Write a protein that binds this ligand. Structure first.
Ligand code: NA
Ligand code: NA
Length: 327
DNA sequence: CATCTG
DNA sequence: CAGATG
């Protein structure tokens, strides 16, 4: 956690690079199990040889550990941190819609900057175009004070369209958090579930109200159960308009809302432990359900949940206010 | 995993 | 349809 910190870090830089610049998924996956294991490792790694003794730890990595332990640096890392090509890829990638793959093509065609991108807006798709237009806004965290106003609007409009909708804002927002990255709304309806053959309108009507009032400003991706967009809190008595924020809305069959809601709410560490305890209690949980665990090895059959309560209950546990879902 | 692009 | 992004 701090005893093999640099090591785990260098490894991470390395891994990243394989994957992002090279197309070295193998190598890339190599650095990661390695950091993973050194990380768990109980002692202060004093040498490569020591490390090598570990699984995931080969001779090449051992080698690197040496030079780094031997000197506060690593040549390779040093070379990579310079390379403009490598830097461009790390950067373009910050644009929403641009992944590594696209980053390479772009660089190869000589686009390595923001300006580059504007010039060539033509070679970018809708998502990437939007992603460029709001580059700044998108990198700005969302203060809870805004979050409360967003949520305020969203719920009031879903309500109008149909009293029967059930919307929930998950995320760190929900675990208390002072600011957040984007807005994630879980949506359900009685008239939609596991069997029920669809209802696309279910999602579309809402998305539509939201734009009616101008809260949603653009669409990144809109399918029949998941929508990726951009919204914006109306600028008041103009002087101060707000940044454009990322928002996502997803329709879930009512029969698996709470597991969804549970799940999306995190934190990751919370889930795990919860998942791990579920297991003890003779259960299983995932993003959509909790199932009784047979002894034959496994076994299923979705237990029925009416709230996040039902879930805890099941595994016979202490109902946790979202806030303490930290770990 | 669900959407989009080409 | 593969393949890419979130
Ligand atoms: Na990106
Ligand atoms: Na292939």
């Amino acid at each position: 956690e701090t005893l093999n910190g640099g090591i785990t870090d260098m490894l991470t830089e390395l891994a990243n690079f394989e994957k992002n610049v090279s197309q070295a998924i193998h190598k890339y996956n190599a650095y990661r199990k390695a950091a993973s294991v050194i990380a768990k490792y109980p002692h202060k790694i004093k040498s490569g040889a020591e490390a090598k003794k570990l699984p995931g730890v080969g001779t090449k990595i051992a080698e690197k550990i040496d030079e780094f332990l031997a000197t506060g640096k690593l040549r390779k890392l040093e070379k990579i941190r310079q390379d403009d090509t490598s830097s461009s890829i790390n950067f373009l990638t910050r644009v929403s819609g641009i992944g590594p793959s696209a980053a390479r093509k772009f660089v190869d065609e000589g686009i390595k900057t923001l300006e580059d991108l504007r010039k060539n807006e033509d070679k970018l798709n809708h998502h990437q175009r939007i992603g460029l237009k709001y580059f700044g806004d998108f990198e700005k965290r969302i203060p809870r004070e805004e979050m409360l106003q967003m949520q305020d609007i969203v719920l009031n409009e879903v309500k109008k369209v149909d009293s029967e909708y059930i919307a929930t804002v998950c995320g760190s927002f929900r675990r208390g958090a002072e600011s957040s990255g984007d807005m994630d709304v879980l949506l359900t309806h009685p008239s939609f579930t596991s069997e029920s053959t669809k209802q696309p309108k279910l999602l579309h009507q809402v998305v539509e109200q939201l734009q009616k009032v101008h809260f949603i400003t653009d669409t990144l991706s809109k399918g029949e159960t998941k929508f990726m967009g951009v919204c914006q809190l109306p600028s008041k008595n103009d002087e101060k308009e707000y940044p454009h924020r990322r928002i996502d809305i997803r329709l879930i069959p009512k029969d698996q809302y709470y597991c969804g809601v549970l799940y999306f709410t995190g934190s990751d560490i919370f889930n795990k432990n919860m998942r791990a305890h579920a297991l003890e209690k003779g259960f299983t949980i995932n993003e959509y359900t909790i199932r009784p665990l047979g002894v034959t090895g496994v076994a299923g059959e979705p237990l029925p949940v009416d709230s996040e309560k039902d879930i805890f209950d099941y595994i016979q546990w202490k109902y946790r206010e979202p806030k303490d879902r930290s770990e």
